[PDB]
Amino acid sequence: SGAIYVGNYRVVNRHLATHNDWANLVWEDSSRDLLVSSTTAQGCDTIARCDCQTGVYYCSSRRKHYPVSFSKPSLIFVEASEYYPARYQSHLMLAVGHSEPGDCGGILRCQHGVVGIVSTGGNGLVGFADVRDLLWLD
Ligand SMILES: COc1ccccc1NC(=O)N1CCC[C@H](C(N)=O)C1
Ligand SMILES: [Zn+2]
């Protein structure tokens, strides 16, 4: 679990969005596993606008943060799950690091701000949905 709170927006994994997220929908994209909903309170986070390929992510299954080197946002095949058929997920960044399914929503940050959230993983890999291209979040 986890979310980004920026301005009057909440950014979550689309597959973990709540009934309230869908009732206050701003934008969603199944191919990116992202959903953005509107909030009444002002958010605590700021978004990176950069080309960093290193950063630190929060891993809830270890209660710890880990440093990572990650690939540039790309189209990656993701196997079927209970949430989606087998498909290509876009704007995904992969890295070597521990993750389990419930780690989705953990934030990846570089020195500039929030880069994205955990969205995929397996066998010593962790994948992050990029948010740096969503300029309207600002
Ligand atoms: C962090 O996720 C994992 C880690 C280790 C093992 C498995 C996972 N599950 C995982 O990759 N997905 C399940 C939920 C929806 C995901 C998606 N974006 O399509 C895919
Ligand atoms: Zn950066």
Short mmCIF file of C-alpha atoms and ligand atoms in Angstrom, two decimals:
data_model
loop_
_atom_site.label_atom_id
_atom_site.label_comp_id
_atom_site.label_asym_id
_atom_site.label_seq_id
_atom_site.Cartn_x
_atom_site.Cartn_y
_atom_site.Cartn_z
CA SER A 1 0.00 0.00 0.00
CA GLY A 2 0.94 3.65 -0.32
CA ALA A 3 0.14 6.92 -2.08
CA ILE A 4 1.71 10.23 -3.23
CA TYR A 5 -0.06 13.38 -1.97
CA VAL A 6 0.78 16.43 -4.15
CA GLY A 7 -1.35 19.59 -4.21
CA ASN A 8 -5.00 18.49 -4.34
CA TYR A 9 -4.15 15.08 -5.85
CA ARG A 10 -3.63 11.55 -4.50
CA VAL A 11 -1.63 9.14 -6.76
CA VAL A 12 -2.11 5.40 -6.11
CA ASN A 13 -1.64 2.09 -7.89
CA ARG A 14 -4.76 1.70 -10.07
CA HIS A 15 -5.20 -1.91 -8.86
CA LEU A 16 -5.34 -0.70 -5.20
CA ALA A 17 -7.62 2.33 -5.75
CA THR A 18 -10.55 2.54 -3.33
CA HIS A 19 -14.24 3.27 -3.96
CA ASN A 20 -13.50 6.85 -2.82
CA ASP A 21 -10.58 7.18 -5.31
CA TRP A 22 -12.93 6.19 -8.17
CA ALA A 23 -15.66 8.59 -6.95
CA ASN A 24 -13.14 11.47 -7.03
CA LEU A 25 -11.39 10.35 -10.24
CA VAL A 26 -9.11 12.78 -12.09
CA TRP A 27 -7.21 10.39 -14.41
CA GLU A 28 -6.38 6.68 -14.69
CA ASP A 29 -4.36 4.50 -17.02
CA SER A 30 -4.54 0.73 -16.80
CA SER A 31 -1.44 0.38 -19.02
CA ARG A 32 0.58 2.32 -16.39
CA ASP A 33 -1.14 0.88 -13.23
CA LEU A 34 -1.81 4.50 -12.12
CA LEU A 35 -4.87 6.34 -10.78
CA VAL A 36 -5.09 9.96 -9.57
CA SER A 37 -7.97 11.19 -7.39
CA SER A 38 -8.81 14.62 -6.02
CA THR A 39 -8.36 15.58 -2.33
CA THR A 40 -9.71 18.43 -0.14
CA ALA A 41 -6.52 18.79 1.94
CA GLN A 42 -3.20 20.07 0.53
CA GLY A 43 -0.60 17.30 -0.04
CA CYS A 44 2.75 16.70 1.73
CA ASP A 45 4.88 15.56 -1.30
CA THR A 46 6.76 17.22 -4.23
CA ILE A 47 7.51 15.56 -7.67
CA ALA A 48 11.00 15.18 -9.20
CA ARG A 49 11.42 16.63 -12.71
CA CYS A 50 14.70 15.00 -13.76
CA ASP A 51 16.43 12.07 -15.47
CA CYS A 52 17.85 10.36 -12.34
CA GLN A 53 18.37 6.60 -12.58
CA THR A 54 19.36 6.12 -8.92
CA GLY A 55 17.28 6.69 -5.77
CA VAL A 56 15.89 5.16 -2.61
CA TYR A 57 12.61 3.24 -2.21
CA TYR A 58 10.52 2.18 0.77
CA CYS A 59 10.00 -1.62 1.09
CA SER A 60 7.08 -2.33 3.44
CA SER A 61 7.84 -6.12 3.56
CA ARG A 62 11.19 -5.25 5.22
CA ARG A 63 10.14 -2.01 7.03
CA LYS A 64 13.27 -0.46 5.40
CA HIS A 65 14.47 1.81 2.63
CA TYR A 66 16.91 0.51 0.00
CA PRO A 67 19.10 2.29 -2.61
CA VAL A 68 18.45 1.24 -6.27
CA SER A 69 19.76 1.77 -9.80
CA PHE A 70 16.74 1.61 -12.16
CA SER A 71 16.11 1.55 -15.90
CA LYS A 72 14.55 4.46 -17.82
CA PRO A 73 10.69 4.33 -18.15
CA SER A 74 9.85 1.63 -20.71
CA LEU A 75 7.27 -0.83 -22.03
CA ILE A 76 7.72 -4.12 -20.11
CA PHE A 77 5.78 -7.38 -20.28
CA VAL A 78 3.99 -8.17 -16.98
CA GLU A 79 2.51 -11.65 -16.34
CA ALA A 80 -1.18 -12.08 -15.56
CA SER A 81 -2.30 -11.47 -11.99
CA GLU A 82 -5.70 -11.34 -10.22
CA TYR A 83 -5.81 -7.62 -11.22
CA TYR A 84 -4.79 -7.66 -14.90
CA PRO A 85 -4.42 -9.98 -17.88
CA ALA A 86 -0.90 -10.61 -19.21
CA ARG A 87 0.05 -7.28 -20.91
CA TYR A 88 2.73 -4.67 -21.56
CA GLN A 89 2.88 -2.06 -18.80
CA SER A 90 4.22 1.33 -19.97
CA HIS A 91 6.35 3.94 -18.11
CA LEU A 92 7.80 1.16 -15.89
CA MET A 93 11.35 1.26 -14.42
CA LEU A 94 13.00 -1.96 -13.21
CA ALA A 95 15.66 -2.42 -10.55
CA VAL A 96 17.28 -5.16 -8.48
CA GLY A 97 15.76 -5.04 -4.99
CA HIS A 98 13.42 -6.98 -2.77
CA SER A 99 9.67 -6.75 -3.28
CA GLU A 100 6.45 -8.67 -2.55
CA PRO A 101 2.93 -7.83 -3.95
CA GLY A 102 1.88 -5.81 -0.88
CA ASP A 103 4.92 -3.52 -1.41
CA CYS A 104 2.99 -1.74 -4.21
CA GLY A 105 2.61 1.96 -3.36
CA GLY A 106 6.03 2.37 -1.72
CA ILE A 107 7.65 5.62 -2.86
CA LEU A 108 10.86 5.87 -4.90
CA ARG A 109 12.65 9.22 -4.34
CA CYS A 110 15.84 10.80 -5.72
CA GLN A 111 17.46 14.05 -4.46
CA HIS A 112 14.86 16.06 -6.50
CA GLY A 113 11.66 14.59 -5.11
CA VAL A 114 9.25 11.72 -5.73
CA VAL A 115 10.05 9.66 -8.85
CA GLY A 116 7.33 6.99 -8.71
CA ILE A 117 5.73 4.14 -6.77
CA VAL A 118 6.33 0.36 -6.55
CA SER A 119 4.04 -1.38 -9.06
CA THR A 120 5.61 -4.79 -10.04
CA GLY A 121 8.27 -7.21 -8.84
CA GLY A 122 9.50 -10.73 -8.39
CA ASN A 123 12.63 -12.87 -7.83
CA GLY A 124 14.85 -10.06 -6.55
CA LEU A 125 13.38 -7.41 -8.91
CA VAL A 126 11.26 -4.36 -8.13
CA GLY A 127 9.41 -2.24 -10.75
CA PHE A 128 8.32 1.39 -10.31
CA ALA A 129 5.55 3.29 -12.14
CA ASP A 130 7.11 6.63 -13.15
CA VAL A 131 5.23 9.87 -12.35
CA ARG A 132 7.88 12.44 -13.48
CA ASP A 133 6.21 13.01 -16.86
CA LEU A 134 2.82 13.98 -15.27
CA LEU A 135 3.51 17.73 -15.32
CA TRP A 136 -0.09 18.65 -14.43
CA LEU A 137 0.39 17.14 -10.89
CA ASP A 138 2.18 20.49 -10.05
C1 LIG B 1 5.46 -5.78 -6.28
O1 LIG B 1 4.74 -6.86 -6.91
C2 LIG B 1 5.27 -8.11 -6.84
C3 LIG B 1 6.44 -8.44 -6.18
C4 LIG B 1 6.84 -9.77 -6.11
C5 LIG B 1 6.09 -10.76 -6.70
C6 LIG B 1 4.92 -10.46 -7.38
C7 LIG B 1 4.49 -9.13 -7.45
N1 LIG B 1 3.26 -8.76 -8.06
C8 LIG B 1 3.19 -8.05 -9.22
O2 LIG B 1 4.19 -7.72 -9.83
N2 LIG B 1 1.93 -7.75 -9.66
C9 LIG B 1 0.69 -7.97 -8.89
C10 LIG B 1 -0.10 -6.68 -8.71
C11 LIG B 1 -0.30 -5.98 -10.06
C12 LIG B 1 1.06 -5.72 -10.74
C13 LIG B 1 0.94 -4.95 -12.04
N3 LIG B 1 1.42 -3.71 -12.04
O3 LIG B 1 0.45 -5.48 -13.05
C14 LIG B 1 1.80 -7.05 -10.95
ZN ZN B 2 16.28 13.32 -9.64
#
